[PDB]
RNA sequence: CGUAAAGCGCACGCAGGCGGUUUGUUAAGUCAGAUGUGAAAUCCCCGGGCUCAACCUGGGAACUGCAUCUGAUACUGGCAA
């Protein structure tokens, strides 16, 4: 139910940083990216029609750690919505609570982010919420409870958030250690290289 | 506006001039290519 | 721009309803160009034609058969243009690349021809070189001193040149075709109804045209 | 024997159009001027003319824009076979909007758009694309 | 800003006096995204021959499309040898969704969120041509209003 | 549906299907509106409650239909010329 692996081979095979150890370090310096995958890592692999929509597919839930049926009905949730699909099914994995826990820089990855969310330490609108695919409604305060307040990880995760973007949709403020999802994010406003036509052709297929 | 031509009666006169009935009146449909541009 | 003149149109034999607009047609079983239509039709194509060759354009006649030539070469050669007179090359202006080298060998084995060494060691060789001398000077004798591939090409019959026609249509070159009643106006840009073998025609159409070319801006 | 007269007419049309032909006649009727009058008025043929007294005869003056053909492609769509008559919700759109869909209604024979703009619908003549 | 890519090779035979002799087939479609979609066939006696052939005649004879906003017009079906085609605006309908080798022609010629269904045979080489033929004889709202006056 | 499967060996013709052209009437088909009905749930849309989701739920849309009444009369049909 969720991925629980070598998390660098993850992002090896995709050939791009899907920013799964932010960590403390900077930019990898110990991954060996693009190199090996695997044993025959080395070779090119040259990749074929669905291999290139299979593979952005992958790359965004290995992003946003999803899983396959739950990512296929965020597809469809995404479709029956009104506008653009791509960009109605990022709006949809971008405000699941483990996501807008790791924007406002209160876990160093997605995954630190979905224990404090898990291990029932982030409160919405007051109220304790548990579950990582819990979907943030714009004009939301999400913020971290007094246990697991001014713990390390928070605090550190806080230290490598001026090191990233700094997302327009959020406030941040890492003072009372609480967040308000203002708006739903623009396509423009994440990202810019994932390409979700690809996966709106590999799930209509 | 029409360019500077023989006179429709000297036209008429080349007709006269054409020996026998000498008129052809077949009637099809004309097209013409488009200008080409000054560019 | 207007004289009486003769030719009055030809071609009983394998007529062509495309010609159907040009036509008076009554005489002997053969048919009559209304000359009314050609007069107009004419002046456009000196008139795009004097327009290109102002711009200092190249031009190709193209006269294959008898007697456009000399009269092709008369008239391309009374300009400072260029001609094709003996059998038109199946591609000479969409693979020009390849009619280049040959061009090439034409100017390098009349250099070695008239100036070089044209009795050296072979007489019987020395006599195989100049006939490809004939032969590359007929083939492409206009067309040698060109350089480009041209900028407009005056066809004097478009059934019997319907090769150079066609590949002036693939590569967007203006065509200037005297057709005749057999003919079909393929792709010629400027048709003009005429008639493509009889050289009292030709000369006076040649004529006209050549006229025509050589004012540039001068 | 002729069973559809206005299926002949738009043959008419689609063979003079296939033949750079300059106009086109036919014997003619009410519906066919009417139809006729729809097809001058959405700008698809230049002009209609009908003569005659006792035997009349529909003469349509054909459009070309350029070398082409204005008329592209015109079908005969409630043919006697099987008549196709829609509602003012069904009433189609041909070419997304770009050719009009000649539809005789209780009003008149008008074109899809302005019988859905008249708010009624009728018996689909035919598509002009 | 030229954007090729090749869609189908094959190996094709001869039979000549001494056993058979095997050549090779590409077929490129190129286009620069924004209408202006071309297709080459090339054939050579290796692959990479063949498939510079095909994009060398590929960037020539490439044709105009008059595309909407990212997307075709109207619906339009384009037919080729055994090959019948159907098209369909889908007016942002997400994602090019077409037949293979409909994909390509479709996705290099800046088209992006179109329906398509392929008819009839899908031999590659027919179907475009088929979408050529199709994105060729669809035409822009003031193009009919250039022909019909208004 | 010439040659891939597929035009009866050819005709005459009943029931059937289709039917040139003009005017008048009808209004059966056709179209427009109204009313009654088309159970509730389900699907769809906008919301609400379970920490979210599945789930439950409020309101609408829909149920492409049928019947009746009111009209329109271009096309098809009936009738008369």
């Known amino acids: 139910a969720r991925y629980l692996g070598p998390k660098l081979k993850l992002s090896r095979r995709e050939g791009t940083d899907l920013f799964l150890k932010s960590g403390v370090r900077a930019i990898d310096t110990k991954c060996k990216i693009e190199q090996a995958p695997g044993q025959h890592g080395a070779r090119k692999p040259r990749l074929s029609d669905y291999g290139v929509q299979l593979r952005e597919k992958q790359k965004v839930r290995r992003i946003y750690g999803v899983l396959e049926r739950q990512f296929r009905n965020y597809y469809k949730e995404a479709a029956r919505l009104k506008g653009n699909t791509g960009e109605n099914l990022l709006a949809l994995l971008e405000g699941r609570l483990d996501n807008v826990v790791y924007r406002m820089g209160f876990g160093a990855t997605r995954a630190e982010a979905r224990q404090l969310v898990s291990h029932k330490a982030i409160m919405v609108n007051g109220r304790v919420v548990n579950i990582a695919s819990y979907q943030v409604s714009p004009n939301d305060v999400v913020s971290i409870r007094e246990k697991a307040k001014k713990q390390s990880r928070v605090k550190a995760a806080l230290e490598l958030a001026e090191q990233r973007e700094k997302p327009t949709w959020l406030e941040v403020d890492a003072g009372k250690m609480e967040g308000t999802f203002k708006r739903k994010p623009e396509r423009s406003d994440l990202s810019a290289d994932i390409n979700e036509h690809l996966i709106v052709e590999l799930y209509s297929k | 506006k029409k360019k500077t031509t023989l006179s429709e009666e000297d036209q008429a006169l080349f007709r006269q001039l054409m020996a026998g009935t000498r008129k052809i009146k077949q009637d099809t449909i004309v097209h013409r290519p488009q200008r080409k541009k000054i560019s | ?218 | 024997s002729m069973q559809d007269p206005i299926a002949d007419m738009l043959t008419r049309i689609r063979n003079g159009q296939a033949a750079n032909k300059a106009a086109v006649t036919m014997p003619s009727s009410k519906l066919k001027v009417a139809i006729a009058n729809v097809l001058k008025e959405e700008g698809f043929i230049e002009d209609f003319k009908v003569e005659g007294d006792t035997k009349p005869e529909l003469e349509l003056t054909l459009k070309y824009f350029q070398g082409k053909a204005v008329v592209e492609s015109i079908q005969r769509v409630s043919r006697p076979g099987l008549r196709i008559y829609k509602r003012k919700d069904e009433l189609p759109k041909v070419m997304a909007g770009l050719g009009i869909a000649v539809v005789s209604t209780s009003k008149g024979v008008m074109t899809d758009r302005a019988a859905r703009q008249a708010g009624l619908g009728g018996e689909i003549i035919c598509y002009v694309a | 800003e030229l954007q090729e890519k090749l869609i189908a090779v094959n190996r094709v035979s001869k039979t000549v006096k001494g056993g058979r002799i095997f050549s090779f087939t590409a077929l490129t479609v190129v286009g620069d995204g924004n209408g202006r979609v071309g297709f080459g066939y090339g054939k050579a006696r290796e692959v990479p021959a063949a498939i510079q052939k095909a994009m060398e005649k590929a960037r020539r004879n490439m044709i105009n499309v008059a595309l909407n906003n990212g997307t075709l017009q109207h619906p339009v079906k384009g037919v080729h040898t055994g090959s019948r085609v159907f098209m369909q605006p889908a007016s942002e309908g997400t994602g090019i969704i077409a037949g293979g080798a409909m994909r390509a022609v479709l996705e290099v010629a800046g088209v992006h969120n179109v329906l398509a269904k392929a008819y009839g045979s899908t031999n590659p080489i027919n179907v475009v041509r088929a979408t050529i033929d199709g994105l060729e004889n669809m035409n822009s709202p003031e193009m009919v209003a250039a022909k019909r006056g208004k």
């Open chain 3, 1 to 218: 721009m207007l004289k009486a003149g003769v030719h009055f149109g030809h071609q009983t034999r394998y007529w062509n309803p495309k010609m159907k607009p040009f036509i008076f047609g009554a005489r002997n079983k053969v048919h009559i160009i209304n000359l009314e239509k050609t007069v107009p039709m004419f002046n456009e194509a000196l008139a795009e034609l004097n327009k290109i060759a102002s711009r200092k354009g190249k031009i190709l006649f193209v006269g294959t058969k008898r007697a456009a030539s000399e009269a092709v070469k008369d008239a391309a050669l009374s300009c400072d243009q260029f001609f094709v007179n003996h059998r038109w090359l199946g591609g000479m202006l969409t693979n020009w690349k390849t009619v280049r080298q040959s061009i090439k060998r034409l100017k390098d084995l009349e250099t070695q021809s008239q100036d070089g060494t044209f009795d050296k060691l072979t007489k019987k060789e020395a006599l195989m070189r100049t006939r490809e001398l004939e032969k590359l000077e007929n083939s492409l004798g206009g067309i040698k001193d060109m350089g480009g591939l041209p900028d407009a090409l005056f066809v004097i019959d478009a059934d019997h040149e319907h090769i150079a026609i066609k590949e002036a249509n693939n590569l967007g070159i203006p065509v200037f075709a005297i057709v005749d009643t057999n003919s079909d106006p393929d792709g010629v840009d400027f048709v003009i109804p005429g008639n493509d073998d009889a050289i009292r025609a030709v000369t006076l159409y040649l004529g006209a045209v050549a006229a025509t070319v050589r004012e540039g801006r001068s």
